[PDB]
Amino acid sequence: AMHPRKDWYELTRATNWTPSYVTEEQLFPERMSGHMGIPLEKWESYDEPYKTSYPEYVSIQREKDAGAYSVKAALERAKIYENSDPGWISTLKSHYGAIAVGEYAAVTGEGRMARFSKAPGNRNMATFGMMDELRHGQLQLFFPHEYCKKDRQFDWAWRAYHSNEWAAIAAKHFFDDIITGRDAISVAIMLTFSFETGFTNMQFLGLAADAAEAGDYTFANLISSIQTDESRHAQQGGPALQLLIENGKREEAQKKVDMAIWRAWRLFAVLTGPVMDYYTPLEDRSQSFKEFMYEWIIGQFERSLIDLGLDKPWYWDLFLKDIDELHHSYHMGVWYWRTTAWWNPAAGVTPEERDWLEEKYPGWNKRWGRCWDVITENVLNDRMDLVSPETLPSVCNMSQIPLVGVPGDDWNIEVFSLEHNGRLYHFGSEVDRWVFQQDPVQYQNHMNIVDRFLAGQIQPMTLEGALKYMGFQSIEEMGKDAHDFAWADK
């Protein structure tokens, strides 16, 4: 006979002890552990709500992968690459580049907890977390690898995080801030709670819905399987937060959640926003980006945050306005500066799409449409020189994404600036500036790409010089319009 997990589980996490040969602080240094002075004994009340154990883990993960790889194998000849809308292919390129090696970086966030968390259950769940993120990194290199032979842009599934391409810098600045660059408890809060119960559902399930509509089941099946792991190891954050609140650290916990949610938001607005409302073919848009945000972030995530005892973030109303506005402008920026991307942005403003946009975002045509009107005119008159930029956008010193606003009839754009230690910084929002001020030592001597451009680090100091600095190794690799401007014909 076998004995049920409930009867021996406590012994697997009965692993805290009282150090005698080194001090408690030497074994769990605050800068790596982030215990906020809460003594070891208090951490033993940590109770991970989504448990697993080693034999179950290897058995079940074996089955998860067998399915993922079998589906990929069975669908190799479905002509997704050849037959898919080029906007969908660019969605794959953007996803794998922006995510694959970041997943592998998440191993290190989990590792930070496995070694340095004072909560025994956290150290064990983070061990399975290490393994999960290894899976995710390896899956999302293996799957795009077959497309290398078809298109050099898929090389960026591996290369992007090794580059200084501007979106890759935005990704690394975020993930290095919330995953690899902070103490174990900050990782628990910012990564597993804020990012992994909050935003990743947008990219791994919201996007899966669109992928299924687009008939790409290899991808939809992959990312939804990945998220089943996420759903388990993300549950490390809640008990950490509850423990902090119980031990008088509510304010500190709230600040970390507030910061991580906003940082995640700005990154997903430039990655997922344009995918859902522009690159994904109209017929395959299960819901709009805003609709998905209201499902996943407002309806599900923010309600969970409340249930655990935290408050709505102070910037709530700013956040809501941003959901209506930000990604439309980020999309415009990525597309106009498409040559700086490793995917081919789809413009997504055929009349039929503009009608959809106007329905999903009343007032769109009087705003962003004013810009797309100019662009469309130039395309129809083959003034292609006016559809390609000859300077650099100004960039946020937090998000590393260009500084934008609302264009057109009720134009409004604001930069939030800050003098600090003899230097002038510019942020794309009140919240981004606030994030900086929460922890200046984390950020203060970081130079964004345009800062580097102005300080002589990019040579020559030209757009072409910048493109080379960003690591593009051939002309083929740089972004172009997804449909070679065939959309103008409509």
């Binding site: 810009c371 009839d409 754009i413 930069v415 510019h426």
Partner: protein, 83 residues
């Protein structure tokens, strides 16, 4: 005497790096910014382009140079049309 500024043009969607000159009139500054905006993402229009510090209620004089304005490098300016 290269002088980098970050400029936001009226009805555009973003702020861009535009490198002007220390001795440029605000009229010349406005032109150099417009180059990267009008007929790209912003429709041309009648009127005089003016230069102001970002979100300010005060406009710089047309003949005033950037050197005379007290502007610092990499500060943000708007380019807008007179009401």
């Amino acid at each position: 005497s290269a002088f980098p500024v970050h400029a936001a043009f009226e009805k555009d969607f973003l702020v861009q790096l535009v490198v002007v000159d220390l001795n440029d009139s605000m009229d010349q500054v406005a032109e150099k910014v417009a180059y990267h905006c009008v007929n790209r993402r912003v429709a041309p229009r009648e009127g005089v382009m003016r230069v102001r510090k970002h979100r300010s209620t005060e406009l710089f004089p047309r003949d005033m140079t950037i050197a005379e304005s007290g502007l610092n490098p990499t500060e943000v300016i708007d380019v807008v049309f007179e009401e």
